[PDB]
């Protein structure tokens, strides 16, 4: 380092550029090597080697490559540079501007210039790892910010989750700061963006911090934010307040996480640190103002809507975070269960999970790629914890208002959407209410046994509805009360109405629901042989169709063997007479060989069971036999 | 209503 100043022969305009990679390389390896015992502090001219970086970095003469090493510097010359950051400043900014496009997926991956965009994305990031900058994090942020999920995030999630693990505690509560400040500061920016800032790398980076270290984010923070949300709500004349209330949204998603991953002892105790909410001086004795914002929390919690409002999804979205915000704060403070309802599911004829879901999306179910699918919907995690942790802090008041919501809004008074979002929150929610089972079967099936749910066919949501039925049945069986015959009859119609499909094994897996379906609780359920038989009186040679009739017959017989022409709409001679007539068809094997199978198990029945109709079926049966016998040996 | 959040 010392003779350094002979290098101006390289870096040199007229220097080769791959002698201008080498020198950069050198200079990697020395401050590897270094510790930056000397030269990064005091000790040497640094205005010469940090005016030779700025111009270096300045350069346009030179390829993206060669800035891409030279963003190798500032895991240096980024560590007590008191002052002289503004120069970085300007020439970070003139670079990032110049080569980093702000909506990057007109570029395919394989794209050169994609891969030097990424190769600089990465490098910078590797920079902000040695380098625990404040300013290059801050650098970073707003290159992340400009629009959601389109530089590959998943990378910029995990180094930002690795910068907060380790550090100074001081040096993470600078960097918090940092990255406080761009969301607060009044300068008029995209509200997207905004958001995004403490979505996308706040919100994380406060996840990960070291223990300890959150308190005094929370301290430094908790005043103005709590000011912020106390009111100024009022004003709308403006579209402008869209910022406003993306203010008010991250104030939310920061809390609500600080109340989270913090101690009780630390959140409210008989000492109370966080005693800012008011002056603090006099009030040291007991914690009971920190709720205070719970108090807050109520009024966007219930807020009545508009009738013709303009920012309805983000108001929609911004109560939603209110109420993880609650769910939070109900989870960490209050230990009684009465408590956990203290205002979490109280509602008002004004009331709340009314607000907190969309009735506008379409919202299909679906069988594709690669749980998570659309329970990505918002609050529903912070809901599951909730039922979760309060089973395991032993309620059926809590469930009784829900379902007052389910099904006392049995009524379309509430849209179906939200029937399918309390339904969804009972599926993932299965295992926590296993007993609390028998009253709210009806429910449940009611919901399926609309004829509106979601779209049209076997739905996922159905098969989870199904699901939570059969896995119930076993110790519940709630099978044959008013409600439960008319509701399953519905049920086993609609079932066996749509059991075909066009996909090789979904159509094996709605028979296997169908088969669980009957066999698991066979009680007072009508089997509609009407159905069945228009299921499989196909005369079309060389048709499909009569298979699915077959194969369904086959459930209802395999399951306990019932009777097969209780005065179903059809006469039985013809009824079994087309039901043989099927193995003629000998062109698919599925179809005849099927046909057969399920005619030789409808023999044993009647056989056993010793009916009447087994003279005239067997006569039947001999009768097609035959007509294949001389004819057609093989089949 | 407050008292539910008090107590």
Request: aromatic share 10%.
């Amino acid at each position: 380092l010392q003779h350094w100043k002979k290098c101006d022969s390289w870096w040199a305009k007229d220097s080769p550029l791959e002698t201008k990679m080498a020198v950069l390389a050198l200079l990697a390896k020395i401050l590897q090597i270094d510790s930056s015992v000397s030269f990064n502090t005091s000790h040497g001219s640094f205005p010469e080697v940090f005016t030779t970086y700025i111009s270096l970095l300045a350069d346009t003469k030179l390829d993206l490559h060669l800035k891409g090493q030279a963003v190798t510097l500032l895991p240096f010359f980024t560590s007590l540079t008191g002052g002289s950051l503004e120069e970085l400043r300007r020439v970070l900014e003139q670079l990032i501007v110049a080569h980093f496009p702000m909506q990057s997926r007109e570029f395919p991956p394989g794209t050169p210039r994609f891969n030097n965009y990424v190769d600089c994305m990465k490098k910078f990031l590797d920079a902000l790892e040695l380098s625990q900058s404040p300013m290059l994090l801050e650098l970073m942020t707003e290159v992340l910010c400009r629009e959601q999920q389109h530089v590959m995030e998943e990378l910029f999630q995990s180094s930002f989750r690795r910068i907060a693990r380790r550090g100074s505690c001081v040096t993470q509560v600078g960097l918090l700061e940092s990255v406080y400040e761009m969301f607060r500061k009044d300068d008029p920016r995209l509200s997207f963006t905004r958001q995004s800032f403490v979505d996308r790398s706040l919100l994380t980076l406060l996840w990960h911090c070291s223990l300890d270290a959150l308190r005094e984010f929370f301290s430094t923070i908790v005043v103005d934010a709590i000011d912020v949300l106390k009111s100024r709500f009022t004003k709308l004349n403006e579209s402008t307040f869209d910022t406003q209330i993306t203010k008010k949204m991250g104030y939310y998603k920061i809390l609500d996480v600080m109340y989270s991953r913090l101690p009780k002892d630390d959140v409210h105790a008989k000492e109370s640190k966080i005693n800012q909410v008011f002056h603090g001086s006099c009030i040291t004795e007991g914690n009971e103002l920190t709720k205070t914002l719970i108090k807050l929390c109520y009024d966007a919690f219930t807020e009545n809507m508009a009738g013709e409002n303009q920012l309805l999804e983000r108001r929609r979205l911004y109560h939603c975070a209110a109420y993880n915000c609650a769910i939070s704060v109900i989870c960490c403070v209050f230990n009684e269960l009465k408590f956990y309802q203290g205002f979490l599911f109280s509602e008002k004829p004004e009331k709340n999970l009314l607000i907190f879901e969309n009735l506008i999306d379409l919202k299909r179910r679906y069988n594709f790629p690669v749980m998570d699918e659309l329970n990505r919907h918002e609050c529903m995690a912070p809901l599951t914890a909730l039922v979760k942790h309060m089973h395991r802090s032993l309620p059926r008041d809590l469930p009784s208002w829900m379902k007052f919501l389910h099904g006392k809004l049995g009524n379309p008074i509430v849209p179906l959407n939200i029937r399918l979002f309390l339904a969804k929150l009972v599926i993932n929610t299965e295992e926590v209410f296993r007993p609390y089972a028998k009253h709210w079967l009806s429910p449940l099936l009611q919901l399926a046994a609309s004829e509106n749910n979601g779209g049209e066919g076997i739905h996922y949501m159905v098969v989870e509805i199904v699901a939570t039925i059969l896995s119930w049945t076993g110790l519940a069986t709630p099978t044959g009360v008013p409600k439960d015959e008319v509701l399953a009859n519905r049920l086993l119609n609609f079932l066996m109405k749509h059991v075909f499909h066009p996909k090789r094994a979904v159509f094996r897996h709605n028979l296997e629901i169908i088969k669980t379906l009957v066999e698991c609780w066979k009680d007072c359920l009508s089997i509609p042989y009407r159905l069945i038989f228009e299921k499989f009186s196909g005369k079309d040679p060389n048709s499909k169709d009569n298979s699915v009739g077959i194969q369904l017959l086959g459930i209802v017989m395999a399951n306990d063997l019932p009777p097969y022409d209780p005065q179903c709409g059809i006469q039985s001679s013809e009824y079994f007479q087309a039901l043989v007539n099927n193995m003629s068809f000998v062109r698919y094997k599925e179809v005849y060989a099927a046909a057969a199978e399920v005619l030789g198990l409808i023999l044993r029945y009647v056989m056993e069971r010793k009916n009447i109709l087994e003279e005239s079926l067997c006569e039947l049966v001999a009768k097609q036999l035959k007509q294949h016998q001389n004819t057609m040996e093989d089949k | 209503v407050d008292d539910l959040l008090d107590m």
